[PDB]
Design a protein around this ligand. Structure first.
Ligand SMILES: CC(=O)OCC[N+](C)(C)C
Length: 382
């Protein structure tokens, strides 16, 4: 039925949205010409998400996951046409803030719609795997090509083309869902106080710190230590798409085979992330570094695919069977690392070094990994 047509289009919206969050970080430092001046500009997407999601979470579970998606895809189009006609600084800051304002709606609505259109267990974790595989591509493989096109054509035409594509996607979604025709949700305070939800939300931030504390402070370290040209410094995350999709598929197949092993999968993913981030400050060549990044990226996929359906399963077993207000917690959790990283990571590296920050990150992840054992009793609460 329609069901598949909605899943594909929502996934494409998550791919284009995740491309504009990373294709602009190399371009911005060109038009600017205070190390804490750029940092706040780069850390404005997550700051706004931390003040809008609490006031937008309960709004999602009241208008049925369609009006918020359209609003988000309109705000994203408005934000994109701007970078295109954007120069100076204030305009860029406003565009970056509008990006977060638009992301506080679209991603949450899309994930909620994917989780709600699929109520059964063997298919929910299969749809939420395709959603994550579509999110990864476009954030891990696309920014290099965006930069290559920037160094050839500029900024005006590509951004207008991307805005046109986003508007086309929003329009055909409006034509397919047909929103132009015609239960009480749990308050976010009650959801946040549930111990299992808090445990899951803590993991969603611990497993993501060693991807926002490394992105802004890897190129300089690579250039200083290893003799690397622009090509390796630019295409350093590209050979990591394959481990991500492989891990997503493996987690989906294992969840289908044995239920109630999501906690084990999450703990294994946390251990892998910690081991990779601890191994990273040892590579003195391109290939070992690429392998370490492969391990780090394969660690994230397991945790994400294992613990994303768990929130919906818990909010279905207990509380009220309405989503939208339970993924705002996940978005808030992400927007803590993505707001605290790009501002203080450089100062931490400059005051301590690159060989201690990674050690601390790995120790934190490996120490939080045992905490996920408290979910071993889930599956009998049904
Ligand atoms: C590696 C990767 O998937 O990056 C996506 C960012 N994230 C985890 C917030 C969706």
């Amino acid at each position: 039925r329609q069901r598949r047509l909605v899943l594909v289009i929502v996934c494409v919206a998550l791919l284009l949205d995740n491309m504009l969050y990373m294709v602009i970080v190399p371009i911005v430092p060109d038009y600017i010409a205070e190390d804490v001046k750029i940092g706040v500009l780069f850390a404005s997407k997550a700051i706004l998400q931390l003040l809008v999601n609490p006031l937008s979470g309960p709004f999602i579970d009241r208008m049925s996951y369609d009006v918020p998606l359209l609003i988000g895809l309109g705000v994203m189009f408005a934000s994109t046409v701007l970078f295109a006609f954007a120069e100076d600084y204030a305009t860029l800051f406003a565009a970056r803030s509008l990006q977060g304002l638009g992301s506080a709606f679209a991603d949450t609505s899309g994930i909620a719609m994917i989780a709600d259109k699929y109520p059964e267990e063997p298919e929910r974790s299969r749809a939420l795997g395709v959603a994550l595989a579509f999110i990864s591509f476009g954030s891990l493989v696309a920014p290099p090509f965006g930069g290559i096109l920037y160094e050839f054509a500029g900024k005006r035409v590509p951004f207008l083309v991307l805005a046109a594509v986003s508007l086309f996607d929003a329009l055909l979604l409006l034509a397919v869902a047909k929103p132009f025709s015609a239960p009480v949700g749990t308050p976010i305070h009650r959801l946040m106080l549930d111990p299992y939800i808090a445990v899951v939300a803590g993991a969603l931030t611990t497993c993501n710190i060693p991807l926002a504390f490394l992105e802004p402070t890897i190129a300089t370290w690579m250039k200083h230590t290893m003799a690397a040209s622009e090509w390796e410094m630019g295409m350093a995350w590209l050979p990591a798409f394959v481990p991500h999709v492989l891990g997503v598929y493996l987690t989906v197949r294992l969840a289908a085979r044995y239920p109630h092993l999501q906690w084990l999968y999450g703990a294994l993913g946390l251990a892998v992330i910690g081991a990779s981030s601890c191994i990273v400050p040892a590579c003195r060549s391109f290939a070992p570094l690429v392998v370490s990044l492969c391990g780090l990226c394969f660690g994230i996929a397991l945790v994400d695919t294992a613990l994303l359906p768990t929130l919906a399963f818990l909010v279905d077993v207990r509380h009220v069977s309405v989503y939208g207000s339970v993924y705002a917690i996940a978005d808030i959790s992400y927007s803590v690392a993505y707001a605290l990283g790009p501002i203080v990571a450089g100062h931490i590296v400059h005051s301590l070094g690159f060989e201690q920050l990674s050690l601390g990150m790995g120790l934190a992840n490996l120490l939080y990994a045992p905490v996920l054992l408290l979910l071993r009793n889930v599956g009998l609460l049904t």
